[PDB]
Amino acid sequence: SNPSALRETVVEVPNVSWNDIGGLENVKRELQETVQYPVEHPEKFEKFGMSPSKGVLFYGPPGCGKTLLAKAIANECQANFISVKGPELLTMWFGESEANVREIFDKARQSAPCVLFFDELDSIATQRGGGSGGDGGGAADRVLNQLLTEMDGMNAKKTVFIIGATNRPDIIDSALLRPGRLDQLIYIPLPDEDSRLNIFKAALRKSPIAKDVDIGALAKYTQGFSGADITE
Amino acid sequence: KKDFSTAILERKKSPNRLVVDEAINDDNSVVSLHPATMEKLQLFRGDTILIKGKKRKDTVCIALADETCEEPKIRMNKVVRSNLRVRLGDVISVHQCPDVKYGKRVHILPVDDTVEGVTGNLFDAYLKPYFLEAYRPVRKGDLFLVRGGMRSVEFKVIETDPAEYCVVAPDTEIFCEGEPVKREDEERLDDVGYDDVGGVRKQMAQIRELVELPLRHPQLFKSIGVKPPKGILLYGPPGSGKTLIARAVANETGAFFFCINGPEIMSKLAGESESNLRKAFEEAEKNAPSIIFIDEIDSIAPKREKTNGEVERRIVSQLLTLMDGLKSRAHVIVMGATNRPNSIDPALRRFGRFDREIDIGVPDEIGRLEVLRIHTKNMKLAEDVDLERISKDTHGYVGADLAALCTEAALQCIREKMDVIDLEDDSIDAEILNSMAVTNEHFHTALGNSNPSALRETVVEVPNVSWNDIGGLENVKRELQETVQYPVEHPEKFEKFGMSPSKGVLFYGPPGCGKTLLAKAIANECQANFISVKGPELLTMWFGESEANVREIFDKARQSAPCVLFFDELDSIATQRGGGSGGDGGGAADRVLNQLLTEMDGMNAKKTVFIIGATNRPDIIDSALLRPGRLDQLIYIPLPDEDSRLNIFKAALRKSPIAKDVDIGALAKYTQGFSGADITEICQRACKYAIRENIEKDIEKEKRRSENPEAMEEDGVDEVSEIKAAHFEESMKYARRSVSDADIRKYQAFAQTLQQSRGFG
Amino acid sequence: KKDFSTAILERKKSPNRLVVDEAINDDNSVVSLHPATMEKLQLFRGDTILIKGKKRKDTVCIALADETCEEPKIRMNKVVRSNLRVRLGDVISVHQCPDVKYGKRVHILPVDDTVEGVTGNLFDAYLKPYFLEAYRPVRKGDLFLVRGGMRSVEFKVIETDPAEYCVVAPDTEIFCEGEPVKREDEERLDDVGYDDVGGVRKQMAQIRELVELPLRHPQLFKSIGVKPPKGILLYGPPGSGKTLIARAVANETGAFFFCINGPEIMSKLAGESESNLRKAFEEAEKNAPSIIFIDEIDSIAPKREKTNGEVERRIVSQLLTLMDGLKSRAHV
Numbered sequence A: 001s002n003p004s005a006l007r008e009t010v011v012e013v014p015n016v017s018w019n020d021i022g023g024l025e026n027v028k029r030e031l032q033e034t035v036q037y038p039v040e041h042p043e044k045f046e047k048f049g050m051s052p053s054k055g056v057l058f059y060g061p062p063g064c065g066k067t068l069l070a071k072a073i074a075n076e077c078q079a080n081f082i083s084v085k086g087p088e089l090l091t092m093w094f095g096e097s098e099a100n101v102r103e104i105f106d107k108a109r110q111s112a113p114c115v116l117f118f119d120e121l122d123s124i125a126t127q128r129g130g131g132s133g134g135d136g137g138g139a140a141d142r143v144l145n146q147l148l149t150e151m152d153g154m155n156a157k158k159t160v161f162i163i164g165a166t167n168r169p170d171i172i173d174s175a176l177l178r179p180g181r182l183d184q185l186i187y188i189p190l191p192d193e194d195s196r197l198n199i200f201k202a203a204l205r206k207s208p209i210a211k212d213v214d215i216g217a218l219a220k221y222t223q224g225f226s227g228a229d230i231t232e
Numbered sequence B: 001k002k003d004f005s006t007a008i009l010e011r012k013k014s015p016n017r018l019v020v021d022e023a024i025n026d027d028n029s030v031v032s033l034h035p036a037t038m039e040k041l042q043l044f045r046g047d048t049i050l051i052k053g054k055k056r057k058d059t060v061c062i063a064l065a066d067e068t069c070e071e072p073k074i075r076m077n078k079v080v081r082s083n084l085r086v087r088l089g090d091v092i093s094v095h096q097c098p099d100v101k102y103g104k105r106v107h108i109l110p111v112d113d114t115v116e117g118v119t120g121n122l123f124d125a126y127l128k129p130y131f132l133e134a135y136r137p138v139r140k141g142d143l144f145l146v147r148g149g150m151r152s153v154e155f156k157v158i159e160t161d162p163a164e165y166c167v168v169a170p171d172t173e174i175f176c177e178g179e180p181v182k183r184e185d186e187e188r189l190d191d192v193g194y195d196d197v198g199g200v201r202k203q204m205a206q207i208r209e210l211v212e213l214p215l216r217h218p219q220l221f222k223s224i225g226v227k228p229p230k231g232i233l234l235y236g237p238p239g240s241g242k243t244l245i246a247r248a249v250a251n252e253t254g255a256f257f258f259c260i261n262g263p264e265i266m267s268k269l270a271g272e273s274e275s276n277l278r279k280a281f282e283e284a285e286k287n288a289p290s291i292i293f294i295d296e297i298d299s300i301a302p303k304r305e306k307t308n309g310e311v312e313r314r315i316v317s318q319l320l321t322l323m324d325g326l327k328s329r330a331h332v333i334v335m336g337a338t339n340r341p342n343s344i345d346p347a348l349r350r351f352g353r354f355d356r357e358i359d360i361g362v363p364d365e366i367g368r369l370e371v372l373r374i375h376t377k378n379m380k381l382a383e384d385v386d387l388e389r390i391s392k393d394t395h396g397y398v399g400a401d402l403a404a405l406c407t408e409a410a411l412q413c414i415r416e417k418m419d420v421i422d423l424e425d426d427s428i429d430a431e432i433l434n435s436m437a438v439t440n441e442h443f444h445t446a447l448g449n450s451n452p453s454a455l456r457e458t459v460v461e462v463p464n465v466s467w468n469d470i471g472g473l474e475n476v477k478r479e480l481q482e483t484v485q486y487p488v489e490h491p492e493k494f495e496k497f498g499m500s501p502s503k504g505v506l507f508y509g510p511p512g513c514g515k516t517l518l519a520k521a522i523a524n525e526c527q528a529n530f531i532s533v534k535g536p537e538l539l540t541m542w543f544g545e546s547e548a549n550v551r552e553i554f555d556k557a558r559q560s561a562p563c564v565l566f567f568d569e570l571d572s573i574a575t576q577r578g579g580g581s582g583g584d585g586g587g588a589a590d591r592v593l594n595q596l597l598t599e600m601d602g603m604n605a606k607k608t609v610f611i612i613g614a615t616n617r618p619d620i621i622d623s624a625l626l627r628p629g630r631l632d633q634l635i636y637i638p639l640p641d642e643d644s645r646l647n648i649f650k651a652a653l654r655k656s657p658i659a660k661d662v663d664i665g666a667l668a669k670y671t672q673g674f675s676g677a678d679i680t681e682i683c684q685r686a687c688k689y690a691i692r693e694n695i696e697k698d699i700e701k702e703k704r705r706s707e708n709p710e711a712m713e714e715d716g717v718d719e720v721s722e723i724k725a726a727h728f729e730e731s732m733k734y735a736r737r738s739v740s741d742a743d744i745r746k747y748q749a750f751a752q753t754l755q756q757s758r759g760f761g
Numbered sequence C: 001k002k003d004f005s006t007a008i009l010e011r012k013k014s015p016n017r018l019v020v021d022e023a024i025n026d027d028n029s030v031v032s033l034h035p036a037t038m039e040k041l042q043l044f045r046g047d048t049i050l051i052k053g054k055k056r057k058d059t060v061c062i063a064l065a066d067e068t069c070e071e072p073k074i075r076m077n078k079v080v081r082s083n084l085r086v087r088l089g090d091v092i093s094v095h096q097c098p099d100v101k102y103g104k105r106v107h108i109l110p111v112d113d114t115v116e117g118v119t120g121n122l123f124d125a126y127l128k129p130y131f132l133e134a135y136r137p138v139r140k141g142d143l144f145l146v147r148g149g150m151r152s153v154e155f156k157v158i159e160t161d162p163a164e165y166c167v168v169a170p171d172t173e174i175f176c177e178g179e180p181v182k183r184e185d186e187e188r189l190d191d192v193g194y195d196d197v198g199g200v201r202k203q204m205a206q207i208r209e210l211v212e213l214p215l216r217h218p219q220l221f222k223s224i225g226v227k228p229p230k231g232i233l234l235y236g237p238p239g240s241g242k243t244l245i246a247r248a249v250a251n252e253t254g255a256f257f258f259c260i261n262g263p264e265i266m267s268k269l270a271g272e273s274e275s276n277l278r279k280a281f282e283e284a285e286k287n288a289p290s291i292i293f294i295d296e297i298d299s300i301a302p303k304r305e306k307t308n309g310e311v312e313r314r315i316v317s318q319l320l321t322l323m324d325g326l327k328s329r330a331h332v
Ligand SMILES: Nc1ncnc2c1ncn2[C@@H]1O[C@H](COP(=O)(O)OP(=O)(O)NP(=O)(O)O)[C@@H](O)[C@H]1O
Pocket: A020, A021, A022, A023, A061, A062, A063, A064, A065, A066, A067, A068, A069, A119, A120, A165, A167, A199, A202, A203, A226, A227, A228, A229, A231
């Protein structure tokens, strides 16, 4: 048997927790302030007469756990999580057209609190071409401008955080980094010696590993490896 | 001089105008006038009088005398207030009733909800005991309360003789003949009026002077030798105010009102739509003065390119013919309503047709506050509801959205009481029902769970930003004053010297230096409307409304003069014309460039409209935008210097709990080359660190108390949690400039050589 | 504080609420209440009572006494459980039947699948031997089982007198008049309800507070001075829950329900679609409180850019006019 509603956007609390993510202690510590505090304690910011920012960008090497952090922070705050990929957005215009990005943003509004994650920004957020032209990239330009337009109207909703992820920060459009948009910049580094042990343990937290396997031993030999390589 | 546009709304105080006040008597056919007021009115003790109310409703009562009634008071009872539709504080007028008109019959009938529990002939229990020999004046259509024991039955004046009003002499032979005046008839009483519309005063004044004046006092127009416009077209965001305003004006002007709903016309068979239109117009002409409100006119008269059938173009043509046939000027006005002004067929928007248009746009803060006050005037609000905060927090909310917000607040109030309310029972405890009140937290929750609709529509409002919110930039402000304020406040000054100014400015500089804020500040100083448009928004307009988006924003700016049309983020639309001209992704930048220049060309003749741009990429800015007659003035916004950064920090923290030991000036020295955005993000990081600190402190305190409840609440109490210097140090630890030292000399070079871009490289 | 959104769904435990339990007797017109529960209910041994079930279904039985019935138990038999539509563990309520209403007639008719193998007058074999002088309470619309030997014939309470419920006194002159109660009628019984919808609680709560509250307890809204919304629009992936939820809410709220299927409206000739819409709205207004569920509304009211004909825009306009005409607030 095959499912039918497998392409529809799913608004649900992810099952990922901080445990599934190895290391990144400082990133988690700052994400708590950036997301959880303005949600669980919204009146705190009004007490000090200063509003927070509803935008974050994850940039770093592939396989370092950028998609997992968004899901984990959503799970911590018990907020709905909407996952959107750049490839999916690019086909939306050749389809429902203008009423796809608007629709996902409206769904995020209706599902507040929410964490609207845009994975794989390497395609939609391709830097505005100097020789502006073409319709193949006229879809990246759409998913860029129409997305920024929605970001502008999203800062007044409150309890909605827009998180991005890009493995190509060089081509990321500079407009997305504007205040009122994805202006907070968090760097996800390659795991270090200590982080790789945690990554191995998490990847094998439910594995039949023998009694003679030294998980820490592999960490020394595997340096510069992303978490994806550690899982492979 | 003043702006006389909002002059018709003003109420002219007159000696006959008295303010509403509570009475010393509950008599419904008797009020109490102060002796001095009666002397001004030439009245005497116990004399019948006609009180002019609202919504063309008036009553008749005998005026008594009492010295406690201040001069600006009338001392009417609750029944008279309800009949006149006037709450305490309104300004009614008083006219004499010289024709007391002792009536031979005063038809009286009861209301079903006031009769529940009566087991005897109402004539022998309520009417006759209080009317016989009482000589109580009665006004047709007014509900006077009566009592015949425990039950209180309120009767409407059904049919007097004379028909208008009379005095109930003993000769009034009448009894209660049935119960045909059931309470449900109130749906068509106190329905709509001027007081039921809030947040629109300029539009309302325009409608009143274009509709009510021609129909009530055409003598002015006839003497002046001008024929008033007959076609009015309300348009605006859906749900804003259109259908309400039309009915309110129709009821307040007191003219025959005929409603022609578009769906109702189009839901009938061919040959009945046109028949109904013809009947409506003929009836309006017969019963002049008259008004013909065509709601949802876009359905019966859509754009001819979109309509497909023949029995639709036939209806459009019939409507056009009927409007053309109204030039007889039989005191007939056709008012329209359409949220899609462009979807309307062009033929309607022409002379002899809907040529005058009013935009019922999104309300501002005060308008939303007034709307909320109007809608909550009946709900059981608690004594701690602050509608000012809600109005401030409701941006992009049309009146319908505010009504939905109030309803959601009430529903949330019910949910809180669901624990003590059982749904299985077919009846709910009366005490619980009467104890439900809507609190501020309910409204806040409803607002959080409610979303706005008119948040994408262009907003034409005076910004709240002032020069204080902007740090430094003294020279820029000084030149902006000359460039903008002087040609607006003092337009004749330029004509005195025989030289016209320029209606274009361009802001170029490093990001985060305060280019968007300056436009808003200068608009606020001149009290001129501000229209904010971003390049990303323009690029999607072409893939959409197409040519009629830029034209529409420019037309809106024209209608909203004085105005400051700001185009933020020119880095996209103003991308320099590609040497290898081609492509459709950039074929939208080329559109928003050429079509924008075309509008700029026609905008220099409008006057009092200034087009301001902003670009962080002056290198790619199209050289055409710098032409005279366009954005030719070039103002460079530099990175803030040592002195400017102190002001920026102070402004960012002008409402912050900063401690007493924080040296704002100290940070300025360390932060050099930082834009204002970085200076604000520093404060944001510091505030977040302080939130973490005090969250942990409160958690530790509560856990200390819970780790032995015997530990009492010591004198230690939650403090300001002021932002200590440690938080600022930590923020500066991660703070990083958004403008490099290599990307400032380049801005200086462009400041030198920007306007030279119309030639070669 | 808590999230009060999912508060209407909560069942309020009351002294009159008893949990379902198996009975010591298979009698269909008699249940067994614990003596303490009866004392809380002011009942006595062998007293007729009305049991409030689900889907607006209820039965009437005489409550006996037994100490084995724990306080949160009612000890009903299988037939009563089926009639009430309640499985073991549900929480029904108990109300008294002070008006026993000794009935003059208790119309009884059999079901075809329970009669297979009967060769004698059912009145002289099943009804009279167990009803005469038994004073068994009967509730209209409930299937009580009877036996006259090996075959077990279950009869529905067709038409009592009083109509709602009564007690079968010896004066009840009645016999089995034909077999018009064939078992296939069960397609319209125990069809849908709240318990038949799973996986939606927030949406279900919203629908219940926007539909059932305005129709059953409008006094709250009237006192608060708020007019409840009259238009609700369910949407979601095809096949999710829409048509099921609409019918479930309609049946649970117990209000006149009228279904206007879009294909059915559009499958008829011009002038009959609008006529049917008008008839539906008029009937709903007449029989208020009411609900008008328009399934597949996208067919009768699609986007105006996509619709081509005139007899489709006419139907859309008729629907818009009818909805605009509902501001009378006749509990519709
Ligand atoms: N820090 C980590 N801890 C544990 N597993 C990790 C970590 N980082 C990556 N992984 C594993 O590697 C997979 C891929 O990483 P993911 O979290 O999808 O990163 P990404 O930035 O989305 N990668 P890509 O889309 O390929 O650029 C995860 O789903 C985990 O299985």
